[PDB]
């Protein structure tokens, strides 16, 4: 019985890598008291897990960007976990950035994600990660697109790109989520055919809200199988259905993902611990 | 990429079932007004996927006895679908056992789970059986043990007995529950071999307390994968992670019983709608 | 990677079937004084997995048939295992039979595996159970024939006499030793078939000495895939190969049994223990 | 049969590990083996003893013998005296490695240096689950892709209990464009405790049904070697069936089981 033996080796060996997965965690800012308290829980509840790192996202507006060095500052001092934030090229000058990564540099904050920045209605990540790099030798995190970055002249390019990044100063790469598992091991394969030595780490997108996942996903390129939008099919008012159904195919990745060589996952919690809490459990990731 | 291709294979095919797969769902006593309240509350949900048929058990004492019947009569007012009480040889003379069921058929209830029983601290269920059969054209469904009835002098005879149990008149087999996919799906085949010609339907149970499945299954000679036994490690006290593996557990099961074949699964409830709810709707079983 | 995930989830459950299986051994009445110190030695070793029952073959010559119910004593009080005897049709009247029969239960011994016998160079084995349940109610055992008995006109003859004789009040059948899994198997299924209501426990025997296991199958109608005789082909004078080949044979047997449901194994052990030790070993069959 | 065998033995520090050896050797030579190799362990017996007993395995069996050369606290200069040496006198197969450390050079800087010498048929090391010291399994593959790239004729891997392992690294290296065979390195364990220190040393995952096959056997050798013997010999069945056509076996001096596991592979002697 093919499937039936598969799926057992699958579980074992999941069980056997207990204590050898690395996790981190990412967060972004709360625009409202009732999203700051979630936060917290979240954080908390996670942070025992003893995550390598956490990050927490870089938005445009002043009051957010300064939201995220509070949060970023908040969450080494009530965890005393390493915290990077992500920075983006985004409506600064290089010598703004220079500030803002001297800053971050001499207040303990030595690991950043760096990025380009999504558009709002110049320099590239590879400027950020020179420029950052020539400021103070810095732990540097960057994007990578298993499905091509939608903005690419061409998937040679845009893997092309992620080499010029990471040779610039890269310590790992976190993908865009992903819901086609194939694409993720091909785009790793190809990584290695276009020279590049960083470790490519799967960005994991827990999915409990699929009408907004998917809006999100028609927008990054990213590709929902047709089995996944029939799974949430007729779910919108079933929020309880939707979490046991999304944590179903989380896990399942992760399982895969796990059996491929991956030890290095990034959960895109959207603040909340739950989902990403029992995900790290089968991986054996636990207090 | 094997693990791949084989996960997003399986996946698509669960999704093209949707609609072939019959269900039904078992029911106990409730003790308490609280239980009471989850239960119709659980009926009322369920009911909305159609099940071919619902159940409810039987056990020793009279007044959940009267129980058994009242819930019975509760479900067919509410929901209109057919309900089938569980009877057993326990305390209860052939005489009496004729004359609950000439009222049950005169009530309308015509289909009936026969079993022997759970011994308190004479005759089988096929005895039951034929003696059903002598009071009316009974619909009758009968327990299966993949992993071997824990009295049986040998597998064999076990299987013998089924086998005698459904000639005397059986519509279907339920298994006991069980999480060794391959137990039961080698079974199935030994049971053509012995003869048996009716489906042996799967009894599934969504784990969610893992402590008192453990020892429900250590009474009834369930085996419990290492596996499972880790993944539930270290969760007694966390409730929603516990459901959350559970429900990927169960989801795991019968998507590969799905691809095996079987298309009729009988779910242990345990009087609580949102697992098993949320596996059907994976199976394609929906409002 | 089918071949692979298949081996990992068989080592898998078999690893954790330690605890749920029944085993036993088969030991043979020694012939020279060293053969006893080794039988002796065997029995202690093996005593240590505590084996459902341990059983002692019967042969024909009035002075060995002496010893097989001296051995089952010896091993009775020494170890203080349950000792089955082996008995057979063979040069004894049905009033004889009866004597020993009852002698054995005034001894301790409850349990007897009864055979028709060899014929050295009137009644069957159904015919000595019934005479055995009448003289008391004891545990019996008896011989199948995975791959047909030699004189049965037919498989299905035979298969009807196996019930005969268990219709008539018998608790296990043990196989004549096989290599192929699938005559096992496929026989277990047309015994169910066929209203046999006990487990057909497979009889399990290490191959350490090829020349010898394919003569006594070439007697005993029982086949040597071509897969086998090739396994051993160039082995006459290595014993220690010999034997890693055996060991393995007999591990990928009762690995795939015991996933097939199986529970209960009788090992044909020639009074020698180390191979039929570490096959119990990896089916979590241990001492403490 | 289409199935190719190699045999790795070490320099014997005692006088009764060198009769086990020769016994070995002449076991196992008769299986006719592609080439048999031996290692080397600085402060374990040093280049001289390497060299000494790959040329008494020349003069004795006449097979291809190659030794391990490693280029840790060597010198360019010396490796290249050393590489010309082994050539003139026959010796014309290395096992190019860097070394256990007691960054200088890397195996792919010696791969270099070795072919300007001489045309040698070189092998190297690859591991399946990953070197530990590796940046990350993406670098370490790419590595093993530059060493190769630098003339090697055969890769030979680690030893690994975990088959799928293997061959999903197999199959990492075919798509990054890795041509040359990835020969599996099979460890035969009778010594279970030992396997299982070198494997924790090593970054060599030992599943859990195989530590549970060795539990309560610390004082059964006979047990452990027959439990040892059916779990290699699995291993070489699974694989072979995935179209492994070449083994590396790692003796550790002992022939017997490799012995048995070859025959079971179809590898006997010319009688
Ligand atoms: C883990 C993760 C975290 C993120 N966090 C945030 C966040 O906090 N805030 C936010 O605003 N966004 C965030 N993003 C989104 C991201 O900033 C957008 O995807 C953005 O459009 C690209 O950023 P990048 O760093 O990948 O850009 P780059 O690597 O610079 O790439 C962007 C595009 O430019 C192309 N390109 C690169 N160099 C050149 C060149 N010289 N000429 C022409 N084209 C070129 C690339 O192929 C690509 O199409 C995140 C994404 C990921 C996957
Ligand atoms: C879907 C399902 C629903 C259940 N519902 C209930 C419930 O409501 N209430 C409750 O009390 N229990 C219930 N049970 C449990 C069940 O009653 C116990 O497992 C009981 O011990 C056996 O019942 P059975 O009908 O399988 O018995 P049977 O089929 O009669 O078998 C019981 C044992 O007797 C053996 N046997 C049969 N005939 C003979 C013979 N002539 N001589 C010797 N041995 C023989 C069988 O091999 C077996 O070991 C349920 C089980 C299942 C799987
Ligand atoms: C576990 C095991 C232990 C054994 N131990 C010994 C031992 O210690 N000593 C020894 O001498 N031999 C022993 N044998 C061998 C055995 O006695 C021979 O195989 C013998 O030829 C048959 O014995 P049986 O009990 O199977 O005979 P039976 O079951 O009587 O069958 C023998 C033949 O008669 C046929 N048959 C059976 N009953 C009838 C009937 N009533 N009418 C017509 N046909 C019938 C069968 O089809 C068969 O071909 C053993 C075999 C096994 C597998
Ligand atoms: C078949 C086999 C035989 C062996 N025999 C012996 C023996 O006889 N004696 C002994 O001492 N040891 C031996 N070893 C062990 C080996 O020497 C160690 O594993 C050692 O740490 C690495 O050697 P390598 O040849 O694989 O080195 P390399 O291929 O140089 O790899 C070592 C590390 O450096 C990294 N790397 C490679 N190039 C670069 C670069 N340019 N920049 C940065 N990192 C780089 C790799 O990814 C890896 O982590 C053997 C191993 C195998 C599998
Ligand atoms: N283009 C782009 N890609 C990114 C990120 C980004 O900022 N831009 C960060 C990470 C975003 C991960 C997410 C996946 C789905 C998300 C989602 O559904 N967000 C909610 C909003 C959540 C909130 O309130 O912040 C929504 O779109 O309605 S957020 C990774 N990838
Ligand atoms: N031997 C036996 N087997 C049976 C059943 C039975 O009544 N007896 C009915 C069905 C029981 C299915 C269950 C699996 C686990 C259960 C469980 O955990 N029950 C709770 C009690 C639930 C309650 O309050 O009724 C407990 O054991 O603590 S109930 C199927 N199999
Ligand atoms: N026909 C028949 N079948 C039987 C038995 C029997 O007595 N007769 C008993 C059991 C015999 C099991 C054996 C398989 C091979 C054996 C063997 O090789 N015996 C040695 C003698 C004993 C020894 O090896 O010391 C030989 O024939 O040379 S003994 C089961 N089957
Ligand atoms: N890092 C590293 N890896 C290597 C080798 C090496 O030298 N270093 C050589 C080969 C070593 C193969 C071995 C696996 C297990 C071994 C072992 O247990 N050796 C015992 C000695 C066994 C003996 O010879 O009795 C010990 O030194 O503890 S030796 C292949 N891989």
Redesign the interface.
């Known amino acids: 019985?093919?499937?039936?033996?598969?799926?057992?080796?699958?579980?074992?060996?999941?069980?056997?890598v207990?204590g050898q997965i690395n996790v981190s965690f990412e967060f972004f800012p709360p625009r409202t008291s009732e999203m700051e308290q979630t936060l917290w829980n979240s954080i908390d509840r996670l942070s025992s897990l003893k995550p390598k790192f956490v990050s927490v996202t870089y938005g445009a507006n002043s009051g957010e960007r300064d939201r995220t060095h509070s949060i970023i500052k908040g969450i080494k001092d009530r965890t005393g976990l390493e915290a990077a934030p992500h920075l983006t090229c985004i409506d600064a000058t290089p010598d703004e950035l220079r500030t803002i990564a001297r800053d971050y540099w001499n207040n303990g904050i030595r690991h950043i994600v760096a990025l380009r920045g999504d558009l709002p209605p110049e320099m590239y990540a590879s400027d950020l990660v020179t420029l950052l790099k020539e400021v103070a030798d810095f732990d540097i995190s960057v994007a990578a697109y298993p499905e091509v970055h939608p903005e690419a002249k061409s998937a040679q390019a845009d893997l092309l790109n992620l080499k010029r990044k990471v040779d610039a100063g890269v310590n790992?790469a976190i993908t865009q989520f992903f819901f086609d598992?194939?694409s993720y091991?091909?785009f790793?394969?190809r990584?290695?055919?276009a020279?590049?030595?960083?470790?490519?780490i799967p960005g994991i997108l827990p999915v409990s809200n699929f009408k907004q996942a998917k809006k999100f996903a028609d927008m990054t390129n990213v590709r929902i199988?047709?089995?996944?939008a029939?799974?949430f099919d007729?779910?919108d008012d079933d929020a309880?259905?939707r979490?046991?159904?999304g944590?179903?195919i989380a896990?399942?990745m992760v399982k895969?993902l796990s059996?491929?060589?991956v030890?290095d996952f990034h959960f895109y919690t959207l603040n909340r611990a739950?989902?990403s809490?029992?995900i790290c459990?089968?991986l054996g990731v636990?207090?």
């Open positions: 019985f093919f499937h039936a033996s598969q799926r057992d080796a699958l579980n074992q060996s999941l069980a056997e207990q790992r598992v194939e091991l091909r790793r394969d990584c290695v055919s020279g590049i030595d960083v470790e490519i199988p047709a089995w996944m029939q799974m007729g779910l309880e259905t979490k046991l159904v944590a179903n896990m399942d895969i059996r491929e060589g030890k739950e989902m809490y029992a459990h089968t636990r207090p």
